[PDB]
Design a protein around this nucleic acid. Structure first.
Lengths: 311, 95, 110, 85, 97, 95, 110, 84, 98
DNA sequence: CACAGGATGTATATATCTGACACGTGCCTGGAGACTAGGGAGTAATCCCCTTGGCGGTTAAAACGCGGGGGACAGCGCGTACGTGCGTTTAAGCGGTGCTAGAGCTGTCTACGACCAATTGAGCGGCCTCGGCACCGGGATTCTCCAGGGCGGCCG
DNA sequence: GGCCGCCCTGGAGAATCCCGGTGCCGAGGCCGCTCAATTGGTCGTAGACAGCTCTAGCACCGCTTAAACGCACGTACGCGCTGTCCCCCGCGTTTTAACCGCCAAGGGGATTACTCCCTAGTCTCCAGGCACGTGTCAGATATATACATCCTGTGG
């Protein structure tokens, strides 16, 4: 079972993370990841880098524990990796103050919201998690990702309810018959969007090296390269750039964001001649958000999305 | 010398000769005719007994037989049977 | 004792079927405590008419088959080809009678 | 001689059922018809024979006469002509 | 070779067996079946020849009538082949099951 | 005042009380039960009469009733009815 | 006069249905010339058993329906839910009884 | 006091036949059923009532009792319980 | 947008309601008039007890319900859910009424 | 796809048994004559109950209409299953014999059931009377159905 | 720029179930009382039981051959799928006639006497039909066709 605060006192790792700068219950279940589940209050658990990380939030520190195999005191490299994953080097207090100064609506929203941060996931893991994240509820996508990990991931241990496995390897997803096998699992048409987004990585784009080289590439070139892959629309490409390529300028735009804009910001497509989901409307909304907030508008977009879900 | 078994052989033969003067009957056809006559007799007699019991009478008369015939025989068969029975009863009472 | 000449009750009614035998059968069948005088006459007349009708139809059927003797097949044909007799003998099986020639229109070639 | 008869239902051969169907006007017969027809015939014969043997036992007889079968058929509303009266 | 088409021989057999009147089931197998069935009710039973003949006549009449009903049921379903479901439907409607 | 009519109401009620002490009956249900009893009586009596007539007997005895019950009631009903009738006849003769 | 105490034939056989009434009905029903002594007892026992069985099933149905009086619907349920009783009363229509709940599987939504 | 009735078969309305079919367990009914059904009903009565009238004629009565209908149904093998 | 049930669910509800009930389905007065009209052809100036008409109505309803059950079985046999006059004719012919 | 010819049943003609039916005969048992008696049923008079007929208010149910969605019906393809024909094998069919279990009739007589006079109590009918059931009101639960959900590629 | 691919929750709305008070009328119990069930005999015959006869059923055998059985080949057909279109269901609105209660009249169903004639019951007598022989001719069998029918290639 998942470790509780009174289970293993000597199997914890504490990092400086104040409550104001981060809210675990407002980020992980807000659709930013589909591999974390809640069993006990203020607890989350997900498999990254073939190791199961369980996270809890205290008043001013963040506690983490690791499942692999029978060792404690996780090495500092894991702490550095999780700090990069959580962007602990970036302070959101200044961004919140600037956003409140430029617009009072964010401050009104952030009156009770303080600590909706962003993640830095593995590009392969984030891409394959968000491939099947189109036109579905968060729970359905999370279950889909869990079933995919069970089917194509190396198992680690059964945590008294369900086995935990590492993320499926890229070689096992580029093979034939994968589409039908995943449709048997119940992925729908998105299963095909997985296959066309796997083989082309190794057979048409240049393998993992091409994908990893985009972490230091330009914004537009990386966005276009991600959009080249089948099934990768503008929204998922922006999400991957923001949460897997370290691109704060990427602002996801969707139905929740559009509803927020039309109900609180009263923004309308000026150049565009319609109000439906289109790349031109997405680009206009992104430009408007960047002009109104700045280069780090993705964090404010995530704050609004988390606020929209909890309302 | 055994127990004599009665049947309607002679009467069916006489009726056949009256209808078709130059036509015979096989033994199997005669047995079928015997069974048919016995079955119709049983049906009419049972219906007459039911009619007598329902009306709290203790006798079976021509009226009961006529009602039983009208109940059992369908269509023009009932009409012709009633006509034949009425003619026979009138002739019997006259002589 | 020379009484009057005995005349059968069938002769009095002009019938061929035995009036006395039917009277005895009614009296011994436990149908009722009493049997009227005209009840045997009526029953014999009805039986004679039914036998005459069925035998006439059977004889016509036999003549149509170029035979001069009634077999069970002729009785079956006579009963089934006549609507009223068929209704009367709907639940009756005639031994060695066969069935009417009847092939459904769908099964015939076209 | 005390002999026991078993598995005699197969004596109702496929051609016999086929001829019976042909008399009824059947043009094509499925292969599974035969077993169902055998079952139906067995049920019918069991129903008739039970009544016939009941009649025979009541009369304190050990021979099943034709009139017993006629009475058994008459109980089931299947009066048969040509076997007595 | 002069093979007839699939069904003309069937119609010929229909005509032949509807014109005829003889028993269609062999007598000895039916007699053995009757004796086997009667064994379950009372042991050491004897049958008259007329009794077995009457049983065979009744059985053949019942089966022919059931086959006519089955044929009607099969034609109702736009088919020319009788199937066990047709017999089941006929017996269900007649009240036997 | 009128002519009194007989029915099986009291006996059906007594049997019902023996089976279910805390259950009642309706007038329509009582009439239905009376019709059922009359129908079964008629069936058994007619079958016994046919059995007596066939075997040239002139008396209906418990043997004919038992044979009629076996011919009419299906399955375990016949067995249990025969058992009950035999017990009743034995008790009647003993006392 | 002083005879023995009158003991009914129903009490002698341990039955509830009337032996004397069944004896009279057989005697006056014109079923046979003579009626035996044990035939009324046997017939009364059979009728009592059948009534008891059908009433037990009807009372069970009434209890399952949360009622303390037997109505025609309960009798219909009892008769049609038992194979032997249904076979015995196959051609019997019970007034105000309705029919068993039975919807074919093909018609149900899927 | 002379009153002659005519065209009363239409009194068995379409909803009545639909209710009877629903009692029987029918989900969809064709439009041509109803007329057919009416005819069937008529035929049924044209048998039973006829037999009843015959019994009424035998008793020298001018009214049709419930027992007459019960006996008429008993003739056709349709024993009815609940009317005597 | 008005709330409309899909075709079929109301039919099943009606089936359940009517099979749960025991009351007569045909109206009393039309059936009584039909009975009197039919009886006129057999004997003029007839009279009926109320129980006689009730017995006729119950017998007719039972007969029609049984016929409709057989018709439904015939319709299902033909891979259909709608009953048609051919189904009634087939059921009657199998039962021997025609 | 219409048609003439080849091949296969099929009905028609004719001789030739043969055994099943139609006719003649003896007799005996079941039906007819004649007479009596007693009860079942026909007929008249009466009570009164149940049916028929009329009427008006209420409103539940039937009739009409419209939209549409689901089912009926026709067409098409295909692949297994069943018809058809031939060679083998099986055991049904026929007649012949032999034995005997059991159906079928007969004679005794005994116990069982019909019938009758005398009682008497069980059960039918009439009348309370109260409790089970029909019903209404209101709320909770359940069942059905459609719109919208961090969308995307496409043919208009 | 709608739009459907695939489908999966979440409400909205309607139907149904549950709980409790109301009230009402019919099921159940009681009570007198009349007729049918029970007692106690008596007598007549129904059938149970023993015995004998002789019929038909059961068993076996040989041996002819019709029929069943197995197998191979081909094609008619059942079954699944798709598309169209039409008609039956669901729902709302308007009409109508069923239903309920009331009243009154009288038709005839049911009960009771009274009588009479019609059928069961006996005895006697005789002839109609049943069992038994027996002859002969209608039908079954076999052979020999003349024609109806089915199936297929060649020809256009």
């Amino acid at each position: 079972g998942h470790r509780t605060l009174a289970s293993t006192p000597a199997l914890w790792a504490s990092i400086p993370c104040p409550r104001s700068e981060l809210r675990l219950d407002l980020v992980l279940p807000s659709g930013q990841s589909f591999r974390w589940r809640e069993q006990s209050p203020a607890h989350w658990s997900g498999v990254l880098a073939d190791q199961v990380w369980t996270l809890t939030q205290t008043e001013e520190q963040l506690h983490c524990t690791v499942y692999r195999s029978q060792a404690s005191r996780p090495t500092p490299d894991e702490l550095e990796a999780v700090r990069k994953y959580f962007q602990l080097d970036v302070t959101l207090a200044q961004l919140y103050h600037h956003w409140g100064s430029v617009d009072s609506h964010f401050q009104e929203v952030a009156q009770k919201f303080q600590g909706v941060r962003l993640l830095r996931q593995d590009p392969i893991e984030c891409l394959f998690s968000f491939i099947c994240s189109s036109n579905n509820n968060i729970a359905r996508i999370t279950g889909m990702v869990e079933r995919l990990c069970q089917a194509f991931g190396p198992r680690l241990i059964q945590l008294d309810d369900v086995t935990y496995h590492g993320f499926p390897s890229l070689q096992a997803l580029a093979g034939p018959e994968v589409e039908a096998h995943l449709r048997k699992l119940g992925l729908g048409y998105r299963a095909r969007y997985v296959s066309a987004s796997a083989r082309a990585i190794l057979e048409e784009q240049g393998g993992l090296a091409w994908l990893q080289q985009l972490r230091e590439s330009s914004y537009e070139e990386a966005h276009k390269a991600l959009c080249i892959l089948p099934g990768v629309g503008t929204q998922v490409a922006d999400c991957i750039c923001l949460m897997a390529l370290d691109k704060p300028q990427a602002v996801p735009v969707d139905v929740h964001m559009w509803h927020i804009a039309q109900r609180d910001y009263s923004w309308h497509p000026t150049t565009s001649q319609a109000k439906g989901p289109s790349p031109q409307t997405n680009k206009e909304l992104g430009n408007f958000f960047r002009s109104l907030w700045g280069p780090y508008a993705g964090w404010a977009q995530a704050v609004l999305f988390s606020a929209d879900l909890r309302q | 010398r055994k127990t004599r078994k009665e049947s309607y052989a002679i009467y069916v033969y006489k009726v056949l000769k009256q209808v078709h003067p130059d036509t015979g009957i096989s033994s199997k056809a005669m047995s079928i005719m015997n069974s048919f006559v016995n079955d119709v007799f049983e049906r009419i007699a049972g219906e007459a007994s039911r009619l007598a019991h329902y009306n709290k009478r203790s006798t079976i008369t021509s009226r009961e037989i006529q009602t039983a015939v009208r109940l059992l025989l369908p269509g023009e068969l009932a009409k012709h049977a009633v006509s034949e029975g009425t003619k026979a009863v009138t002739k019997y009472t006259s002589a | 004792k020379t009484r009057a000449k005995a005349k059968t009750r069938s002769s009095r009614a002009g019938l061929q079927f035995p009036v006395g035998r039917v009277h005895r059968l009614l009296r011994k069948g436990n149908y009722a405590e009493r049997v009227g005088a005209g009840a045997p006459v009526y029953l014999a007349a009805v039986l004679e008419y039914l036998t005459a009708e069925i035998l006439e139809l059977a004889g016509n059927a036999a003549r149509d088959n170029k035979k001069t003797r009634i077999i069970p097949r002729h009785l079956q044909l006579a009963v089934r080809n006549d609507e009223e007799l068929n209704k009367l003998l709907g639940r009756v099986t005639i031994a060695q009678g066969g069935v009417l020639p009847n092939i459904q229109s769908v099964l015939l070639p076209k | 001689h005390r002999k026991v008869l078993r598995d005699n239902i197969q004596g109702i051969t496929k051609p016999a059922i086929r001829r019976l169907a042909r008399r009824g006007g059947v043009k094509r017969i499925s292969g599974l018809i035969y077993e169902e027809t055998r079952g139906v015939l067995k049920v019918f014969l069991e129903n008739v024979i039970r009544d016939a043997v009941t009649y025979t036992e009541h009369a304190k007889r050990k021979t099943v006469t034709a009139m017993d079968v006629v009475y058994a058929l008459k109980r089931q509303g299947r009066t048969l002509y040509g076997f007595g009266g | 070779p002069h093979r007839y088409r699939p069904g003309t021989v069937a119609l010929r057999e229909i005509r032949r067996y509807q014109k005829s009147t003889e028993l269609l089931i062999r007598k000895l197998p039916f007699q053995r079946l009757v004796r086997e069935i009667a064994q379950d009710f009372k042991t050491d039973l004897r049958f008259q020849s007329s009794a077995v003949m009457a049983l065979q006549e009744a059985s053949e009449a019942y089966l022919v009538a059931l086959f006519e009903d089955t044929n009607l049921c099969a034609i109702h379903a736009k088919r020319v082949t009788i199937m066990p479901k047709d017999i089941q439907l006929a017996r269900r409607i007649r009240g036997e099951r």
